[PDB]
Design a binder for this molecule. Sequence first.
Ligand SMILES: O=P(O)(O)OC[C@H]1O[C@@H](O)[C@@H](O)[C@@H](O)[C@@H]1O
Ligand SMILES: O=P(O)(O)OC[C@H]1O[C@@H](O)[C@@H](O)[C@@H](O)[C@@H]1O
Ligand SMILES: *[C@@H]1O[C@H](CO)[C@@H](O)[C@H](O)[C@H]1NC(C)=O
Ligand SMILES: *[C@@H]1O[C@H](CO)[C@@H](O)[C@H](O)[C@H]1NC(C)=O
Lengths: 148, 152
Amino acid sequence: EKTCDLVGEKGKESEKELALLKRLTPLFQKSFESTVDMYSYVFRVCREAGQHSSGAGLVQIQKSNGKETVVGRFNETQIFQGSNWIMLIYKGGDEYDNHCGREQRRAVVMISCNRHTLADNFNPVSEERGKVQDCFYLFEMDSSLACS
Amino acid sequence: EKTCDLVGEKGKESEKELALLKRLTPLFQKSFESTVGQSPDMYSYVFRVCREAGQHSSGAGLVQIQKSNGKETVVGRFNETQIFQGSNWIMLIYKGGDEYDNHCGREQRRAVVMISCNRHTLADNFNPVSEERGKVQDCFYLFEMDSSLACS
Ligand SMILES: O=P(O)(O)OC[C@H]1O[C@@H](O)[C@@H](O)[C@@H](O)[C@@H]1O
Ligand SMILES: O=P(O)(O)OC[C@H]1O[C@@H](O)[C@@H](O)[C@@H](O)[C@@H]1O
Ligand SMILES: *[C@@H]1O[C@H](CO)[C@@H](O)[C@H](O)[C@H]1NC(C)=O
Ligand SMILES: *[C@@H]1O[C@H](CO)[C@@H](O)[C@H](O)[C@H]1NC(C)=O
């Protein structure tokens, strides 16, 4: 059962994170895509979001030439929650060539509570690529699973 | 004069973070506190934005005070600040806290503060949410607070 991989040895991961992955299980089968920029974004929870078997959890597609860039891989997942929100992070994306000390890309998704939908309104917020390190692409989406 | 330090040498800091830093200025003069837990683990968490929250000039941005003896533990230092915002929230992270002795591979503590929009106050409801010390890395103390500055 291939899915999101958390830090730590298999079967010895944080119970907090494991519980959140369980809570989001109903979203695994879904696919989320941005609406509208020269790029489109596709996001999935613990499942391949790309079309190149790269293990992507979130990909960026350049519309003009179809280039698919891996923003983050689900084999490097972090997930935590607050009152009415859940933050999901996928590290290990394709490396930058000139920005951010050439570190691997990363996806940060802020899922906010919304009692009216199981999941929707996924869209990019911005890309932070102006730092020497710890850069990231930020996204937001709504989900009733984030309510609590 | 000492304030939050962002990653990167002077002139190499993120334009986004620099702008956000300036936006947070009205919060610098404030101080926040919240007591939670039960002895012998009752703590008093003191948080400040880009200013010393501790009583030992350690550059702490957020401290955990052991109520049983008043001992101060640094959760995060503001010279290791990261800040970013979304549509109706702002997340502040202070790394460089005191090292754990038995958890998280002894990495330095870290404070993560989720600031949610509230048009009724400049800042209120500072609340400790939880502590994640069960991972091999990337552990952290999580807090929440309200602020009109997080409103778009
Ligand atoms: O790889 P470099 O040269 O640093 O350029 C980085 C840029 O590449 C483009 O293809 C996109 O993925 C942008 O979102 C990214 O910021
Ligand atoms: O330092 P160790 O032995 O790993 O114990 C870690 C614990 O210490 C206590 O004093 C508090 O700061 C707790 O929040 C922390 O989780
Ligand atoms: C994530 O997947 C990539 C692609 O195979 C792999 O190189 C990397 O080691 C994985 N990350 C971890 C933590 O194993
Ligand atoms: C953060 O403060 C600590 C405390 O002295 C210091 O050692 C560290 O260098 C500071 N962070 C940076 C990047 O200067």
